[PDB]
Design a protein around this ligand. Structure first.
Ligand code: HEA
Ligand code: HEA
Ligand SMILES: [Cu+2]
Ligand SMILES: [Cu+2]
Ligand SMILES: [Cu+2]
Ligand SMILES: [Mg+2]
Ligand SMILES: [Zn+2]
Lengths: 43, 98, 514, 261, 51, 56, 227, 84, 47, 75
């Protein structure tokens, strides 16, 4: 399987950004809700 | 019993249905409903692959009981051969198309 | 335009894409739910609360992964995308109906989401057995919504089963026999038949459950002369075929992947392979009761079901050994997909071997309803069905998209997930032999070590499914277009380039009648 | 390319699948409202959009086949398979209900009186109306066959006459069955006997109505000369469905009405 | 009396049905409007001459 | 009776670039919009009911 | 009961549970054989530069790999079935106890002679006396005579429950309206713990089982002081 | 209880139309008469509050929530007893 | 068929700007993963 | 008497009928010895068995059913 070089290459910085963002979008919301569990369990 | 009154295909069939109906009675098969019968496949007696363009995918069942069909594009031009068994195939313009 | 293309489709490729999108998203929800499960069990005590909120979570986990991730992806996604391409068909037999199959899914998913919001949700287990699922122990709209979600999902799957069988049987080139179609196509044609015959019995069962709790019937209520066990028979009659319906398309993709990366033309023992799936599909219909060993049935019948269940190992064995034989003289290419294929072959073997153990009613008495059975099915599902999905996804992504994935990243992703799933489910064999029951939000102090290790592994898996999302982004961000593909002589799906045009096989395919 | 050279049908984008999917949502959640928050407005809307969808989806199919001629031989062979397969899934749907019945009647729980029919239940007499319903359904089996044969022989009037007789027998059964329900000395709520009886014979009842509106549709398509002596799948299907329906009644009769009572 | 029967007559009645059926609806609703018929006036959101 | 399938075949085979579910006129169009409207509204109404029932 | 960092089964308190341990060892020995065989073949296949991508004849080897698994399955099936019948065997019990699952507690009934019946509830982790097991201690243990064939009859008065005691190799679902039978036979005195093995609602994890086995003499005096 | 009978080897529409009016319909007439003759109106069954009958675990979604759908007061008692 | 063809055109979402895409993928998979968390929260805040 | 012995007609994991049968049997015998006198002979065996095997709640409810005359079994 061969392919042409990237029409719009993603430099390391660009990757580091997309990787960080991808992580945060998963970890934040869950972290928040989980962080306040006790408050919910106590109303 | 007795009587009549219902239309017939010959008289009420339309669209593509009618086209294959007529085409079929003339003995021709423009909409590939039948399985094409093989020739000797030699350089001089190639299998003639009709086409409505300038390339058509040919599938070659090399040996009768084979479970693997060998696939490839047949282009307009000189006869070409199945990669696994030679067997010549030559493109040809597709006549009836309505 | 967008509407006409995406909401009013009649294109096997676009409907198939719509599925993969639905399945991936549902896959996120199911992953989140699996994490709450291990979050709750990762330290002695209660994090969420009582077995109700906990079991509501366990139930949604099962429904989401089974009905909304695995089935949509394998059958609707790969099924619709690849089948027509592999047999040279312009599309499917019923393009419109095919679309309804897809659109029935989002609503079905809504009903399931709705069920866990109203009241206290459905903490019944994915088996939604009565009396717990009844209008007394589970009053309210929840279970009813769970039932309706299942009705739609079932209508969706048997409508599609009808489409695949018709297409696969009726739309191949005139000179091509059934013994000339590829294993994947056979794999979905057989899965389609299992769905057609098992799904209706489920709908018969849950409709009876629905009337029992809204129309005063007593199908499963002793008071009126009913029998809670009757539901078990009906459910499980579908319930078993259902798991084969879940692994069969995976068997097919594996056959394709192993053969391709071994540089072989065809898989070893093609007709043995067809025989194997057919046997598996059939025996799969006469063994339901192995899920009811501790229910109080006759020793004799209990003996029948352990034997009947065991003979399934033979055909499954010819498949495992055939894939090995396929690798034999091959020119192996250590691509991501091949890595997923090898993992599957081993892990699935272990998980199915572990299922032969449970096949024994005597031993199952002490193994039933414990974490041993949780280990069995996660091996065959988390590292069986799922590994096939990943191998197939990374292998065909270029065909579907036209762009390529970063292989190194793709390999990193395998490494992480391979560690994660094993660490998660391996310990669970012990917890089960040692007695830890299923569906508990907390456990006796002794089970603390393994449950801890287990929960840690689930976090590594989390890391892997996060990375994958990125891996897909990068592929689409860089845009390396596909140029050349190997072995197309024997792999039709690739002959029209990546991605194949909206309309493929406009002018048929020429196949000689020798 | 551009112009196709295969005998298949590439159906135009239709909004109907979306519309029917939305319909299913509305009817299911609507039933949930009726059952719980005592409301039918939602259930009403769903039933509505649903009929709308079926009417249109099937109207188009007629357009594409009769008016546009897309139903070539290959396309038809596929429709035959589809119908067979569908009828099959149905056969297995009813199988859940006979399983239920036999399960209960073959091993009667003590709360029933340890017998079958449970003490307190006064079963209907198979030799009365059940026997009538049986003969009615069976006769429509012979008359729908006569219809089919007239059609193939191009006998317009007779096909119409037979299709009409067939339809009225189907209606006659519906009414007769309706009265039986009303006069029955037991109800859905009368334990497992009533459950088992009313949902099996009930679902079948729904099927006779579904099969009758289908034959009605066929009737009108014929009045409008849609069918040719050789291409009338719409009728073949209507006919196959109608037979599935007699057969299910034969099992109901023998199992529930005769054996289990 | 048999003359009423006929191939055109079937088509003819088929044709005349909309015009005469429309009259019946018009005649019926209008007659309700003329006798000021009760129970349907229950069903009208606007024209309730009753308090 | 009639027999004018020939008139309809022509009407529906007419190359007006219209999709079959609209190829037949203006009523096709109103039916379509009515159906579409009821479905979307209904769907909206259903979401409201669920939001409403989610709460104690 | 189960101890920290346990790998296999809890120690057998009764003879069929012993019988099971041995059968499991047998079965496990085989899964180790096959699962290691497959892994070896796999690594073997992937470790050579030599190729043979042309066609290979199947069927021939196909018999070996179809007849072998068939023989192995008999080797497991036989022992399995024997133990299976051995469990549902013709024995004559000298006592009959009944247990009734309830939403979040079990109740026992010894009624051969007198109508003795009590409720067995889990001791809240808060009111446990030092040395007591966190989610396993019940307030009223089900006392029974060691070295004797007892007949247990399991049922429920509500949803489904499952009465299990691993050390004795027992597990029987509790289905309302049904009387499931099982033979208990400990060959040694002590305290034997078990838990509800069926999802039954909010406190499914908090409704344990504790068997206390003493000699007949002490059993009967206990029974009387119980009413 | 039969075995079969008069063979007419050639079956066309005339044969099926013959069976329709010469067999099918006449049977529907006989049975109709039979059922019209055996029209014995059974006196409403004695009421006894059996617990396995007149089940009610959730009021029906209609009326007073205690009346089954095709409720016939003459032959169907409420849980409490006959209607009136 | 006015349906465009080729890489990046056979999908229901735009792949022309990698960062707009980043946002979309983030909301898509993100909202899917967060849903269970907020449902549990919702159930914990009822009475 | 120790406890109800093994019963060949009830050889499997399910004893529901075992409990049921003996409960009937006893009450059927009882009614007869009553309406016959025959020196008011008594069928204790059946009661010993049914009391051992039948959970209390079943016996209770059945007795009540027999009281109000809504007992479904034929005695
Ligand atoms: C795709 C998923 C999948 C697959 C394929 C299977 C496959 C099998 N499973 Fe299943 N199983 C589950 C998923 C799956 N299962 C799930 C979801 C549950 C739990 C549901 C619930 O109750 O909630 C479950 C539960 C379950 C039970 C009941 C446990 C209980 O008490 O609750 C049983 C018992 O018979 C069982 C057995 C088996 C067997 C015999 C196979 C066989 O197919 C295995 C075949 C494979 C091999 C045998 C290995 C390969 C072959 C060889 C190498 C040949 C040589 C080997 C030998 C001679 C042994 N499974
Ligand atoms: C498809 C089946 C499936 C899968 C894959 C999994 C995956 C996971 N499940 Fe499982 N689980 C079930 C189905 C599944 N599960 C079922 C049926 C039950 C029974 C419920 C009951 O008892 O009623 C159960 C029960 C269950 C339990 C037992 C709870 C109890 O009984 O008390 C636990 C606990 O650890 C658990 C955990 C997990 C974990 C940690 C994962 C992790 O391995 C998850 C890892 C994440 C993934 C593998 C998903 C990533 C894949 C994708 C997102 C696809 C992406 C899309 C594209 C590439 C296009 N599950
Ligand atoms: Cu199974
Ligand atoms: Cu319990
Ligand atoms: Cu429990
Ligand atoms: Mg269980
Ligand atoms: Zn060749």
């Amino acid at each position: 399987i061969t392919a042409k070089p990237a029409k719009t290459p993603t430099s390391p910085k660009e990757q580091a950004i997309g990787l960080s963002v991808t992580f945060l979008s998963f970890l934040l919301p869950a972290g928040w809700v989980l962080y306040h569990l006790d408050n919910y369990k106590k109303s | 019993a007795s009587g009549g009154g219902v239309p017939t295909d010959e008289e009420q069939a339309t669209g593509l249905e009618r086209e294959v109906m007529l085409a079929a009675r003339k003995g021709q098969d423009p909409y590939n409903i039948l399985a094409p019968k093989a020739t000797s496949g030699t350089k001089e007696d190639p299998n003639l692959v009709p086409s409505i363009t300038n390339k058509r995918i040919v599938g070659c069942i090399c040996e009768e009981d084979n479970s693997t069909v060998i696939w490839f594009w047949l282009h307009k031009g000189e006869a070409q051969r199945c990669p696994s068994c030679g067997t010549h195939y030559k493109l040809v313009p597709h006549q009836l198309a309505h | 335009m967008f509407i006409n293309r995406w909401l009013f489709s009649t294109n096997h490729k676009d409907i198939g894409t719509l599925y993969l999108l639905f399945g991936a998203w549902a896959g996120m929800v199911g992953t989140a739910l699996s994490l709450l499960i291990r979050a709750e069990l990762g330290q002695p005590g209660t994090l969420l609360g009582d077995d109700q909120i906990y079991n509501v979570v366990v139930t949604a986990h099962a429904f989401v992964m089974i009905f909304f991730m695995v089935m949509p992806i394998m059958i609707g996604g790969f099924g619709n995308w690849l089948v027509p391409l592999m047999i040279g068909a312009p599309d499917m037999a019923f393009p419109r109906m095919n679309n309804m199959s897809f659109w029935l899914l989002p609503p079905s998913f809504l009903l399931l989401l709705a069920s866990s919001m109203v009241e206290a949700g459905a903490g019944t287990g994915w088996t939604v057995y009565p009396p717990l699922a009844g209008n007394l122990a589970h009053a309210g709209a929840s279970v009813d919504l769970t039932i309706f979600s299942l009705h739609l999902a079932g209508v969706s799957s048997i409508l599609g089963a009808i489409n695949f069988i018709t297409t696969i049987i009726n739309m191949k080139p005139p000179a091509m026999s059934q013994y000339q179609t590829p294993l994947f196509v056979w794999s979905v044609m057989i899965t389609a038949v299992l769905l057609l015959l098992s799904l209706p019995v489920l709908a018969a069962g849950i409709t009876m459950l629905l009337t029992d709790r809204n129309l005063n019937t007593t199908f499963f209520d002793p008071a009126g002369g009913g029998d809670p066990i009757l539901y078990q028979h009906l459910f499980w009659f579908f319930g078993h075929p259902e798991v084969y319906i879940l692994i069969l398309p995976g068997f097919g993709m594996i056959s394709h992947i192993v053969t391709y990366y071994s540089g072989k033309k065809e898989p070893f023992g093609y007709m043995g392979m067809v025989w194997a799936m057919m046997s598996i599909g059939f025996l799969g219909f006469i063994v339901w009761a192995h899920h009811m060993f501790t229910v109080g049935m006759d020793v004799d019948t209990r003996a029948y079901f352990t034997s009947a269940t065991m003979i399934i190992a033979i055909p499954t064995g010819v498949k495992v050994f055939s894939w090995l034989a396929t690798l034999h003289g091959g020119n192996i290419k250590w691509s991501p997909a091949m890595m997923w294929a090898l993992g599957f072959i081993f892990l699935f073997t272990v998980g199915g071997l572990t299922g032969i153990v449970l096949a024994n009613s005597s031993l199952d008495i002490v193994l039933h309803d414990t974490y041993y059975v949780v280990a069995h099915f996660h091996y065959v599902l988390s590292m069986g069905a799922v590994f096939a999905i990943m191998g197939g996804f990374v292998h065909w992504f270029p065909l579907f998209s036209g762009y390529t994935l970063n292989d190194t990243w793709a390999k990193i992703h395998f490494a992480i997930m391979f560690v994660g799933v094993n660490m998660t489910f391996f310990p669970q064999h012990f917890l089960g032999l040692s007695g830890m029951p299923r569906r508990y939000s907390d456990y006796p102090d002794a089970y603390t070590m393994w449950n801890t290790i287990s929960s840690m592994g689930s976090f590594i898996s989390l890391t892997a499914v996060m990375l994958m999302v990125f891996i897909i982004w990068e592929a689409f961000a860089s845009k390396r277009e596909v140029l050349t593909v190997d072995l197309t002589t024997t792999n039709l799906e690739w002959l029209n380039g990546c991605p194949p045009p909206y309309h493929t096989f406009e002018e048929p395919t020429y196949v000689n009648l020798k | 390319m551009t112009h196709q050279t295969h005998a298949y049908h590439m159906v135009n984008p239709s909004p109907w699948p979306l519309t029917g999917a939305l319909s299913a949502l509305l009817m299911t959640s609507g039933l949930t409202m009726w059952f719980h928050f005592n409301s039918m407005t939602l259930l009403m809307i769903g039933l509505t959009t649903n009929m709308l969808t079926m009417y249109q989806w099937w109207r188009d199919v007629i357009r594409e086949s009769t008016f546009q001629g897309h139903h070539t031989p290959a396309v038809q062979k596929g429709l035959r398979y589809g119908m067979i397969l569908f009828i099959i899934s149905e056969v297995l749907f009813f199988t859940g209900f006979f399983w239920a019945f036999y399960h209960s009647s073959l091993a009667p729980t003590p709360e029933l009186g340890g017998c079958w029919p449970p003490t307190g239940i006064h079963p209907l007499n198979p030799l009365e109306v059940p026997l009538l319903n049986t003969s009615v359904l069976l006769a429509s089996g012979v008359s729908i066959t006569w219809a089919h044969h007239s059609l193939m022989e191009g006998d317009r009037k007779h096909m119409l006459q037979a299709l009409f007789i067939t339809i009225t027998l189907g209606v006659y059964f519906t009414l007769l069955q309706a009265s039986e329900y009303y006069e029955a000395p037991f109800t859905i709520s009368d334990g497992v006997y009533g459950s088992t009886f009313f949902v099996a014979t009930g679902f079948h009842g729904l099927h006779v109505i579904i099969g009758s509106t289908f034959l009605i549709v066929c009737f009108f398509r014929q009045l409008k000369f849609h069918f040719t002596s050789n291409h009338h799948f719409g009728f073949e299907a209507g006919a196959w469905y109608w037979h599935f329906v007699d057969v299910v009644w034969l099992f109901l009769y023998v199992s529930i009405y005769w054996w289990g009572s | 009396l048999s003359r009423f029967l006929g191939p055109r007559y079937r088509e003819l009645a088929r044709n005349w049905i909309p015009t005469a059926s429309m009259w019946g609806a018009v005649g019926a609703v209008g007659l309700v409007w003329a006798t000021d018929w009760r129970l349907i006036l229950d069903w009208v959101p606007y024209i309730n001459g009753k308090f | 009776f009639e027999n004018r399938v020939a008139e309809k075949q022509k009407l529906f085979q007419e190359d007006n670039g219209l999709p079959v579910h609209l190829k037949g006129g203006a009523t096709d169009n109103i039916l379509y919009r009515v159906t579409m409207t009821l479905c979307l509204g209904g769907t909206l109404y259903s979401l409201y009911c669920l939001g409403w029932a989610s709460f104690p | 009961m189960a101890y920290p960092m346990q790998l296999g089964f809890q120690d057998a308190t009764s003879p069929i549970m012993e019988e099971l341990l041995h059968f499991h060892d047998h079965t496990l020995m085989i899964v180790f054989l096959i699962s290691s065989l497959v892994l070896y073949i796999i690594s073997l296949m992937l470790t050579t530069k030599l190729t043979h991508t042309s066609t290979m004849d199947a069927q021939e080897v196909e018999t070996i790999w179809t007849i072998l698994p068939a023989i192995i399955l008999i080797l497991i099936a036989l022992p399995s079935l024997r133990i299976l019948y051995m469990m549902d065997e013709i024995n004559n019990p000298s006592l009959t106890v009944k247990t009734m699952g309830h939403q979040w507690y079990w109740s026992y009934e010894y009624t051969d002679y007198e109508d003795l019946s009590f409720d067995s509830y889990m001791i809240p982790t808060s009111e446990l006396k030092p040395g007591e097991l966190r989610l396993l201690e019940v307030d009223n243990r089900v006392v029974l005579p060691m070295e004797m064939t007892i007949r247990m009859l399991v049922s429920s008065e509500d949803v489904l429950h499952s009465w299990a005691v691993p050390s004795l190799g027992l597990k029987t679902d509790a289905i309302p309206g049904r009387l499931n039978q099982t033979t208990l036979m400990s060959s040694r005195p002590g305290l034997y713990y078990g838990q509800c093995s069926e999802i039954c609602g909010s406190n499914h994890s908090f409704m344990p089982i504790v068997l206390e086995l003493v000699p007949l003499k002490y059993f009967e005096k206990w029974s009387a002081s119980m009413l | 209880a039969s075995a079969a009978k008069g063979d007419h080897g050639g079956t066309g529409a005339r044969t099926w139309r013959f069976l329709t009016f010469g067999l099918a319909l006449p049977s529907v007439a006989l049975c109709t008469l039979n059922s019209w003759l055996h029209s014995g109106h059974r006196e409403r069954p004695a009421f006894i509050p059996y617990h396995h009958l007149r089940i009610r675990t959730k009021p029906f979604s209609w009326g007073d929530g205690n009346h089954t759908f095709f409720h016939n007061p003459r032959v169907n008692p409420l849980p409490t007893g006959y209607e009136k | 068929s006015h349906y465009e063809e080729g890489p990046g055109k056979n999908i229901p979402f735009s792949v022309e700007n990698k960062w707009r895409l980043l946002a979309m993928m983030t909301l898509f998979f993100g909202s899917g993963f967060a849903a269970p968390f907020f449902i549990v929260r919702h159930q914990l805040l009822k009475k | 008497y120790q406890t109800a012995p093994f019963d060949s007609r009830f050889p499997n994991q399910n004893q529901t009928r075992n409990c049921w049968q003996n409960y009937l049997d006893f009450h059927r015998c009882e009614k007869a010895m009553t309406a016959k006198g025959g020196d008011v002979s008594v069928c204790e065996w059946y009661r010993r068995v049914y009391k051992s095997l039948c959970p209390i709640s079943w016996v209770s409810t059945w007795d009540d059913r027999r009281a109000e005359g809504t007992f479904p079994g034929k005695i």
